[PDB]
Amino acid sequence: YIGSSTNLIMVASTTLMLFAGRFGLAPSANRKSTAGLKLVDRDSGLQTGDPAGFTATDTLACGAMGHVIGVGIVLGLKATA
Amino acid sequence: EVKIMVEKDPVKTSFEKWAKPGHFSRTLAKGPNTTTWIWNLHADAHDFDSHTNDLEEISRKVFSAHFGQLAVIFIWLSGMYFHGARFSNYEAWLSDPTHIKPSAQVVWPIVGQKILNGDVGGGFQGIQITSGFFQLWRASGITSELQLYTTAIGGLIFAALMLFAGWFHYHKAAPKLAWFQNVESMLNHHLAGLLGLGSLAWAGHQVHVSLPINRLLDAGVDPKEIPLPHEFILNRDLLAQLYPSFSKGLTPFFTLNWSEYSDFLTFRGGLNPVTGGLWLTDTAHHHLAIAVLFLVAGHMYRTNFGIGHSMKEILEAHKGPFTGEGHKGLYEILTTSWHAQLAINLAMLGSLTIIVAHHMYAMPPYPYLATDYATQLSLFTHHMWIGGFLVVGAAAHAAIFMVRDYDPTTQYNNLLDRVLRHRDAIISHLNWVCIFLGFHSFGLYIHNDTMSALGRPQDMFSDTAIQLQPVFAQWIQNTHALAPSLTAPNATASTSLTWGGGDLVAVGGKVALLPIPLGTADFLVHHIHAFTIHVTVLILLKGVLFARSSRLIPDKANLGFRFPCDGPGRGGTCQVSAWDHVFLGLFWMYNAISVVIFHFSWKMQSDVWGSISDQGVVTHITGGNFAQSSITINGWLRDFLWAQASQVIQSYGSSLSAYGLLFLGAHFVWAFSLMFLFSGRGYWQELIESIVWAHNKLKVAPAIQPRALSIVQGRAVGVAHYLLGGIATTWAFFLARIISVG
Amino acid sequence: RSLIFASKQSLSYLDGTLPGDYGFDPLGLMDPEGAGGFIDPQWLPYAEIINGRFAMLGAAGAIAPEVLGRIGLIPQETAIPWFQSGVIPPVGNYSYWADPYTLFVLEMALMGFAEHRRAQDYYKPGSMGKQYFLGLEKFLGGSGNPAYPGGPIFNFLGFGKNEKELQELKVKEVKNGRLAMMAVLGYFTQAIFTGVGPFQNLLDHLADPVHNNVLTNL
């Protein structure tokens, strides 16, 4: 199951979305997207040990978008291939 | 910024405010002086905005009133489960439901009313219920009346909890105004916590309890020997013998092998041929999907965790060149006015209840729902009346928002200001499309009546005369029947049987559903429906738009909501108020919804409901007369209002004679309404003056002066008796006819 | 000065005078701005104390008949998991000297003579050691903080006499208290998923950890 295609997608869907939320490529708690889809910084109040601003909300938020997207890729590829 | 703001002990829990009746209003706190004080005592009882100007105490009053309403509904559900537990034949109906009628009300043998305890079957006497609770409990997997008694006492426990919470959130810890103004958190916890987790919990019930018990009920197993609902959870081999996908044990859920759950989570579609109700593998996949979708939608808005949406930022970015500064201030509308949110919520709940009515005759969700025609007619009719009442109340509280909460300084050049700026165009073009619909539907009915009266059947709008076939509906019904083959692959059958995919489902020798034809008669009555809905929209939207002012009365917002008139000036300003438009839209809701349920009752008694004999022949209740008689008003009076009323008037001396009594008493309440509607206050005031003189002569004058009812109150009493009498007339006629022929 | 999972909203009221004041409050539950009946800064640290001490009696008590049965100090009829011990008579019922419905009435009679006394000391401290109760009402007076009475009965070894010693020992009570709540919640989910007691769940995982984890066992 470790080398199966379900595990490799769901790891990479979660890892890349956490990479996007940490390296300033995705919306997070400490940075907002406007109507022009432009990342502007904000102070949400949440304090962690990350210098970039990644908090406990974003690792639950990007894990969920690692999972909502990741479920659809796995079952999209299951019905197709 | 979203967090809990409450404060402790706002008002002391005392009975000294119970003793003074008009404590909430300053005018009624002086005590009574006329008999109109009693009517303004009830009229201003729930009107919390007229009591105080502070929105915080208003919102606390509304929250504890919600808890009192929840307590009343839980008391009602406790009663209906206690009536199933003690005063029903639910086990007898559950043994075989194709011959025993659902009954859950026993009357007391006192004054001859013991004939109302009729032979419903199963060795039981009582009122045959049409509320659908028996099929609902069969779909819930309820096997014994001990489970009904447990649900009744649990509902009583929850009713005590709602009463305790209503006392708690007004007298011990009541929330402040910014707690209620956290609408993003409220939507996040209603979408995810209420509608998402509620659908998920009912999905878990419909995986563990409803599905195996209802599978055993399709196998002819006696419900006294069916294993109890916790035995499927405990002995999972007993659950695995009915569905082999349970033998894997939650490992395909977390490894995304959801297709291995294809044994019990299916996209079948259609009805169970054993029972005539939707599949619970589809209703469990439905609830799991709307739960994995409402919980996703509940993570949308911004509370206090950074991620989310401020919905003011959603609104204020939605602005267009045809509007300019639109959608701005609507957040300030919907967070500082309870009536605006009440208008939107009432419109969605009423329209949703109409969705419920259509999505239950057409896709019957409960086992043996469709073949019990009394349940189908009563459920559709009840939800149409509730939906029409809630959309008229939506327009009512829209108009109350205009007359009492619309601030014009905060709303400049937005959508609402511009809709008020061209309200003559809206009401005039609505007036044109209403008159056009009225001629092109009802004058088509008058034309059919005239040429059928003049001996010209070829000059009519029939299926044999000039045809008016609904080609868009007849194409959308073919598109929904020929869907599984190409546009919706993964479906075993089609969504509903009323589309055209065959599958003549016969349950108990009675027709559950079949392909519903749509012809010239359906075109005419759907244009009647569109016309009546449009006219109801015309009075109601005219009352919303002209609540502030008019060309007639430019200071109408100062006069209020429940004012009668300005006076006999400007030719007469009678019923200028927005309340009077709600009052007239109540009549147009009667007209609209009554023709809707009349079209429903005749359309499915003629083309759906019936019996199937040998060699596949279908005999309906009124065989094939909707296509030829429902195009004339004489057919509606004759083959519907006279032929089907031949069981509400000769039901006397039988168990259905209370329907005859309430049919006649409903005619009484309707003709009683015409006393209040057609008359006015001053006549009754001078007649009461003569009666007061006769009381002064015999020294029996009350100090509370007898007064005639107010003009707003006289119209309210007249429309209340009109709706009560007419709706009770249709209730009695429906529940006598379709019980008698069902 | 260890601080984890904190926010500027959370440090406005969590100033460090609490025993387990590590700043963990993302939802904002002990806010004194909207203090009410049960969501308030006076009941919530005291709620964590009573839920902590019942879980430390709970996490130790749900594993002690299973550990003592493997080492051979109790009979095997009582060496049973916690769920099949009369608590949930579906998954298992053990015959005591009374049926558990009668034992529940005996429970809330003795809890009602113990937690009603604990209730009214929270609403007013020291107001219970005035009425006569079996000649022992003088010891049941309590301190100002209702979580720690520290009388002749609840501190009958007198451990923690120094104020600096008692305050640092209160940190060890809540941290062992919080671990026990996650243990009982951990005991609850393992009883439904695995269907076997928690000491057998530890012994199954200690042999083959890659084949007896949460992912393999349901």
Added chain:
Amino acid sequence: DFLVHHAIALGLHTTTLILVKGALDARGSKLMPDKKEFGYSFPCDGPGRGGTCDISAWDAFYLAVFWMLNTIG
């Protein structure tokens, strides 16, 4: 026949009630003493003093046309 003769007596008595009430409160009443100076068939007297809808004697005739229709029906 007894019961419908009391229906007939109800119809004549209530029509006579509205019509005698219109004829004798024609000049004025305690709600409005100057009904004679407003003519016979005036609409109302305004929403003030509680409400004066159908106060005129023509309106009592109007309300008793429904009662003669019900009576003769």
Added chain:
Amino acid sequence: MQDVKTYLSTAPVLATLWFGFLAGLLIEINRFFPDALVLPL
């Protein structure tokens, strides 16, 4: 009871308590003496 009995003495409660007693009495007359069309006394 200086105000609880005042609420119990209000017009809707006293109408409910009297007509509850009144319909309670007339039903119980109609049980032990039913179908009464002629007063024999």
Added chain:
Amino acid sequence: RPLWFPGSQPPEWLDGSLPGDFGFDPLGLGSDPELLKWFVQAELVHCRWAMLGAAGIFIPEALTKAGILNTPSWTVAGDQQYFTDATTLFVIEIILFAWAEGRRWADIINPGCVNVDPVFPNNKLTGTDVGYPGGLWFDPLGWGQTGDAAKLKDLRTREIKNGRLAMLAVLGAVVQANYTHTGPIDNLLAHLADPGHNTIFAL
């Protein structure tokens, strides 16, 4: 002052002057002073009828179990046949209690008015408090008329607390007959054998 709920503040209307006062008024129905004197009078005759009730329920059925007397059970005692019919036993009792409780009705309304015997005016009751009539017919031993008030209050407190145990007992005998269909002495001896199981949850 002993109180029912030792942390709670006692109510203002229950000042401890009444016998058996322990501050138990959560619903506060004795808040009115005029209704409190009626309810104390209601509690006195409730206490003494239940103690007379408990001596006709639990005393002769204990003698029925021990074989001292062959009296029937208290639930089926009214069903038995006597020399007077039970329908017309009531109207003898109603007439006899229209003089017993109707003359007691005047003492609650007007104190010190029905203390004089109407047939013979020399006979009178030696009583000064409402609900405690005294005299030879009701207090023939004179124990209820003492000079000291602390002993007199405790003896009236002893009367109330003995009463309210029986009001739990006669109500307890009613529900035990509805649930177990067995005499309460036989419910006691069934409970005295195995008290762990023979309870309300024995079903």
